[PDB]
Amino acid sequence: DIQMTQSPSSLSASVGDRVTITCRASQSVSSAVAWYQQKPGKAPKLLIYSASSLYSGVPSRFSGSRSGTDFTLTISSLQPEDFATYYCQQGYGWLITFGQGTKVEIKRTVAAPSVFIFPPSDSQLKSGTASVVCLLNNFYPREAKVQWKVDNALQSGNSQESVTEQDSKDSTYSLSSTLTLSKADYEKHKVYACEVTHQGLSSPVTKSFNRGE
Amino acid sequence: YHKHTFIVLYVDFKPCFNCYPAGVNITLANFNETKGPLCVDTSHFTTKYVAVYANVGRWSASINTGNCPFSFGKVNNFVKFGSVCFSLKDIPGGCAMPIVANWAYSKYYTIGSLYVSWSDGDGITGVPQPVEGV
Amino acid sequence: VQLVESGGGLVQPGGSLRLSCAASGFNISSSYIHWVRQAPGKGLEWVASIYSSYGYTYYADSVKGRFTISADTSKNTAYLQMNSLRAEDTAVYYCARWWASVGGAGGGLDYWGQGTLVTVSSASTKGPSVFPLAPSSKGTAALGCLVKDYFPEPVTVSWNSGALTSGVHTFPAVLQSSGLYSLSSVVTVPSSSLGTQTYICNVNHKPSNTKVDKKVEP
Ligand SMILES: *[C@@H]1O[C@H](CO)[C@@H](O[C@@H]2O[C@H](CO)[C@@H](O[C@@H]3O[C@H](CO)[C@@H](O)[C@H](O)[C@@H]3O)[C@H](O)[C@H]2NC(C)=O)[C@H](O)[C@H]1NC(C)=O
Ligand SMILES: *[C@@H]1O[C@H](CO)[C@@H](O[C@@H]2O[C@H](CO)[C@@H](O)[C@H](O)[C@H]2NC(C)=O)[C@H](O)[C@H]1NC(C)=O
């Protein structure tokens, strides 16, 4: 008969700036409040208990406070390593529940992307299926667009892309654009590869490879 | 609206007459073992005792300060806290409130055990309120 | 003083399975022990906790009968049995500990295990094939290892037995049109290192029981 609502849902901010996260106690409670940090694809980490209790190995800048039902978690100065998801928990050794949580993002400089071109493996063609990739490394902002051009002809329905989470220190992003196609359709064309459009590039840039050169 | 909440203890017992009485009805308000120990969720709370036991015997009953430092009722004496919960079952690292009675006072039996959890802090407060049947 | 989740994998719907929580550093009887699931790309929710000494079983409103918790003291290790698994259940499963300085009341969860993944689907385990992303033409340049046609997640990627760190970018998994997972892992390198350096990607897939360490060369 007790829960909590975590606000905001998500945010970005400049580095070293103050960040506030709150949880309103659905039906207000006592000192069972606790905040935790979870890095992407990583084990959740303990931050604060009862607002005022910091486990050993916690940096000083983190603070936790109580204002009645509203429970506030304040990081005085935003640090890049802090980038992760953060969740608030109300409960004891019994019960407990979680709020929607707030992932925090780092707002930083306009970061140029690096591009690298990758044809398939000669050993990969053995299956009768082939695949290509265009590499994007260490860029910001995250929002960008990949293009695949084949014999000066664009393609579609074959592009699948994976997105890195913000880099622990770099605060940058990397992108995997995988273009899939069969052995036959590979050998059909030969002069082709990837184009990318981003704020970083005053003029969009393209890498290319002639088949098996 | 809200702020005042109460936790109450009901104990009834029934009577070798001067032996372990058979009728034990220790009762904890709003308490479900399965749900788990009740935890106060309000800034102010008051503590009261209930003689469900019929006044038909020289027997008498009381809860004595024991493992827990803060005795019942003294708790109400404006004692601050950060968090607190109560459960009939022993709570690990918990204060023990022995619930006991004596036939007359000459003989005694360890009839009941109440256990409590301490969380240091300032928001929660020891508080006094009066008596009514509700 | 560490924890380890074990027994994570895949089971088909309606199957039942049991999970292992290994402990190092403390007697499990002395502390509460909880299990928490993480829905894929969603919020965590509490499942249940158990106190070994007083055999206290506390579960969530979510799954009274569906799962059950236990632990063996001689094992010094906690178990989690589950039955009639449903699609919502598919999640990452972490076991973890609880501590209070006050003791009786207000506390927290201090130590976590690495956490394991559990999947419920009809498709059985399938093995991936590893193919190299080869030295490109570009300054710096970079190279990588590529994994395709595996089911189900997760996969373990390593470079030179984890000697490599900064510049690793193990991309999240992607779901193929077929119904398989395909991801790529890579690393940025300088131009000069290429001549001498020997770069090998160690990879392990738990449902296939297959571990490969393949070299990458131009
Ligand atoms: C032990 O003693 C307690 C205290 O009497 C018993 O609790 C009582 O349970 C009875 C039956 O449920 C209650 O009577 C009825 O309760 C309902 C509200 O739940 C009310 O609408 C009816 O008018 C009627 O009063 C009784 O009120 C309740 N306690 C009180 C306040 O007297 C308990 O059942 C006994 N047995 C055990 C568990 O040992
Ligand atoms: C109090 O404890 C009882 C123990 O029987 C709970 O009763 C069952 O709890 C399960 C929990 O999943 C429910 O699925 C059942 O519907 C409950 N049955 C009944 C008759 O209530 C009960 O939920 C607990 N809480 C309350 C407020 O009674």
XYZ file of N, CA and C in Angstrom, chain A residues 1-2 27-32 50 66 90 92 94-95, chain B residues 35 37 39-41 82-83 85 91 117 119 122-124:
84
model
N 0.828 -1.201 0.000
C 0.000 0.000 0.000
C 0.867 1.258 0.000
N 2.121 1.110 -0.424
C 3.075 2.212 -0.490
C 3.916 2.050 -1.749
N 1.808 7.878 -0.670
C 1.550 7.701 0.753
C 2.876 7.876 1.496
N 3.102 9.048 2.109
C 4.430 9.394 2.617
C 4.895 8.438 3.710
N 6.208 8.389 3.908
C 6.786 7.403 4.811
C 7.890 7.992 5.677
N 8.691 7.087 6.245
C 9.825 7.360 7.121
C 11.153 7.486 6.379
N 12.230 7.032 7.027
C 13.600 7.142 6.541
C 14.058 5.955 5.693
N 13.134 5.151 5.161
C 13.531 3.998 4.362
C 14.016 4.375 2.966
N 18.613 6.375 3.639
C 17.960 7.330 4.534
C 18.374 8.768 4.217
N 15.620 15.157 2.553
C 14.210 14.881 2.781
C 13.475 16.204 2.913
N 12.153 2.975 -1.843
C 11.603 3.083 -0.491
C 11.290 1.704 0.068
N 12.527 -1.443 3.428
C 13.403 -1.981 4.469
C 13.974 -3.324 4.013
N 12.230 -5.875 4.363
C 10.981 -6.376 3.819
C 10.418 -5.396 2.795
N 9.630 -5.918 1.860
C 8.895 -5.111 0.856
C 9.872 -4.357 -0.051
N 2.535 -9.826 5.250
C 2.859 -8.545 4.601
C 4.189 -8.141 5.182
N 6.516 -6.618 8.898
C 6.393 -5.750 10.025
C 5.710 -4.455 9.616
N 5.229 -0.634 9.493
C 6.179 0.485 9.603
C 5.387 1.782 9.643
N 5.692 2.630 10.612
C 4.902 3.874 10.742
C 5.169 4.638 9.473
N 4.142 5.260 8.941
C 4.370 6.087 7.741
C 4.016 7.541 8.052
N 14.218 8.552 13.278
C 14.274 8.674 11.813
C 13.341 7.677 11.176
N 13.378 6.425 11.622
C 12.373 5.475 11.099
C 12.123 4.366 12.111
N 9.530 0.574 12.921
C 8.490 -0.371 12.480
C 8.273 -1.341 13.631
N 12.417 -9.333 15.028
C 12.973 -8.717 13.811
C 14.456 -8.724 14.077
N 12.039 -2.142 15.495
C 13.220 -1.805 14.664
C 13.589 -0.334 14.828
N 15.485 3.192 13.625
C 16.255 3.895 12.580
C 16.514 5.306 13.087
N 15.390 12.330 12.727
C 14.685 13.410 13.447
C 13.214 13.537 13.062
N 12.812 13.124 11.865
C 11.428 13.417 11.435
C 10.370 12.796 12.312
N 10.548 11.541 12.666
C 9.491 10.860 13.443
C 9.538 11.422 14.858
